[PDB]
């Protein structure tokens, strides 16, 4: 699946969470 891709405290938002640090 995603690595992390917007599962840093987000659900999925992928590049849209911010925080979320993509592997």
Same mark, same amino acid.
């Given at each position: 699946?995603?690595? *992390? @891709? #917007?599962?840093? #405290?987000?659900?999925?938002?992928? @590049?849209? #969470? @911010?925080?979320?640090?993509? *592997?």
């Amino acid at each position: 699946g995603q690595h *992390y @891709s #917007g599962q840093k #405290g987000k659900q999925q938002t992928e @590049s849209k #969470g @911010s925080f979320s640090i993509q *592997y």
